Amino acid sequence: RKPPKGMFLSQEDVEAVSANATAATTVLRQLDMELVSVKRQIQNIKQTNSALKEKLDGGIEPYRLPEVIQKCNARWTTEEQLLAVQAIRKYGRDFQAISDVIGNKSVVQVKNFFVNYRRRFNIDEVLQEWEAE
Amino acid sequence: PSGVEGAAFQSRLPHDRMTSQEAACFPDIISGPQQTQKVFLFIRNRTLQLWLDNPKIQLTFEATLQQLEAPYNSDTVLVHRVHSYLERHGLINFGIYKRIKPLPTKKTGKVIIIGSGVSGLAAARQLQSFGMDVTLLEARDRVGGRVATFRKGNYVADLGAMVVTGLGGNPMAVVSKQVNMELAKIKQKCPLYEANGQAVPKEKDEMVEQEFNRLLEATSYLSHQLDFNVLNNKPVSLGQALEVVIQLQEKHVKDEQIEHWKKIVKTQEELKELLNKMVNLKEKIKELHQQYKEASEVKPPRDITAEFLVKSKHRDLTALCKEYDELAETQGKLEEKLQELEANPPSDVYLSSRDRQILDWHFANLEFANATPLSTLSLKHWDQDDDFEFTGSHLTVRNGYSCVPVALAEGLDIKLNTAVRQVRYTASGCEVIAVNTRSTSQTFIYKCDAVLCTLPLGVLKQQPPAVQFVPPLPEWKTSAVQRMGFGNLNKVVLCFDRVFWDPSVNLFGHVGSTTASRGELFLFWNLYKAPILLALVAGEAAGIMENISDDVIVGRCLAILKGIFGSSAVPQPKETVVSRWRADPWARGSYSYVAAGSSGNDYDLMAQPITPGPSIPGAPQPIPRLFFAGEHTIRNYPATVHGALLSGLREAGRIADQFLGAMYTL
């Protein structure tokens, strides 16, 4: 009631191959043609990927910067406040980004800063002007 | 099988059930209570056991009764009915046995049997046992027919069949107990050798043998499950189905290759997208780094806008750098995946040329077993009789199968060199016109009550007819003769003086170069305890090689044998024989096969006797006159010696019922 293991005989394929004398020849050589086409596309994309891999040779090693680490400080200096205002103007609500800019302010202290300097720094219209970009 | 159940199994009868024949002869019992049915069945199985325990002497009714046990011996008329039923239908007291009750000199009825083959000989012995006057007419100068044994000196080789296909349920077991037959087992171990002479590696032999069995199962599935038995209004052959299955396997191989390379292109285009993004990212990183350095080289002290510019460029560059890092990680993943894919391609082809050649050898063995090209066998019905195969290993006759018909011919009136030309059957009897084959001007007329036709299917197929029936056989018989297949296979006996082959090997193969010549001397037999090898020709090669001389055939044989065992170990054979069964006019082929467009119902049609019309118009016509037996008339055991034996027993029983009366039914 089932084909033996590994034998493949569907109702569609049998009627396809026995449609005439050379229907089997037609089917098999169409499959051969598609095989050749896919193999040559493989070679083409191999060439293209080889070129693209060569253009990345050397990596980004001459562009990496020594990542200085500095410890968080709770107090806000005037320098850090101005850095925060500019980072809000540039990055919007990206708290991780602003934290990495300022360097010594955790991600939570950035939202804190947002709330505390609510209007001494006009953060609302700063974010408004950011939303225009 | 052991006891009375074993006796029933050995007689091809179910031990716990009454058969259709037994129902026909004992309708009072099978329609009645089950207790009486069991009593009947025990008496039947016990009489069969008594016969099978000593088939060298006759089993009389008195002997059966006094060897029985009460309460079973209490009903003597039932025991007598059972005994006469088994005796009449050839289940007991058949073959060659010492008679106790000697034959009556008062004979009854005249039967002319056409042909002294095994079927004809068995039917003649049975009808003679029943007190009828029986005379056989055979065209050859010998009995046996397609049981033909070449003998020269002490060299012996069968050009007919030589194999007893199991003793479990085989009447030839009884016969072999009655005759001096030396039976020998067949080691089915069979090494192959490609055309060059190199032996086939064992692993590869098993690969292709398993694939061949699987292909056959696939054809069976194609027939039963998809009803692929008719194509453009023509019946499908086993060869057509095998071609279709092989083509579908090759199609699946190509489909798998396409699927694999398509996964490769998908992964490669993922990689292409990734590398393009990585290039754009590296460019943005280069520009951001130059921007960073320019901003960072504004020497301090700086106003806070420039400080913010420096820090902002710094972390923008950091973000893009770890973007590139994650993308390079993904690049490594995809590249190793691609190395894996390119390292694991699926199957290259379905079969190599060498694979296909060895598969062709297995197909040639199949064509040899069936004695016909697979393009002729019926896909639906070619394996119908497989259900009735006997148990036990296939054996052979080491002293020649001919000892069986010869021994069966003892005491019979056989007219050798007597070619039947015309069979006339009428309401009042029959006359058979025959000629002396040595001088055909001489003519004979035989008058009889019944004619039993043993003529092979090839003879019945002959056009123009070698034997003319008056009146013509009805259309339902001639159409069955047309539809049935009559195949062909041949043998080459090679007698040497020195054994140069492996003595422990009973048989070994030779793989052909082409599909066409796959049957050309594909198999060699080393059975006989003498320097004799038997080459076999089957398939289309069987027919084509008959138009080729013995010199050329033995030359091809010796070429193969030199290529296998070395060009010097093979001496020139002392004696050689080449059978040509399709050319033999008293056979015109080897044995029957289920042709595409035929079935086993044609085998049943072949056995139906013919009832002539009435002589006087308006008169009743009860009696049938023309009976048929032989290899081609037995649906469950065709193409065999035991099948011919059984058909002969059957027709003898039927003729005896018709002309001597069936006493066992009242």
Added chain:
Amino acid sequence: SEEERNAKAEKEKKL
């Protein structure tokens, strides 16, 4: 003649 007729054709195919 038929024995002699089959023998000659069988030897024909035999050579």
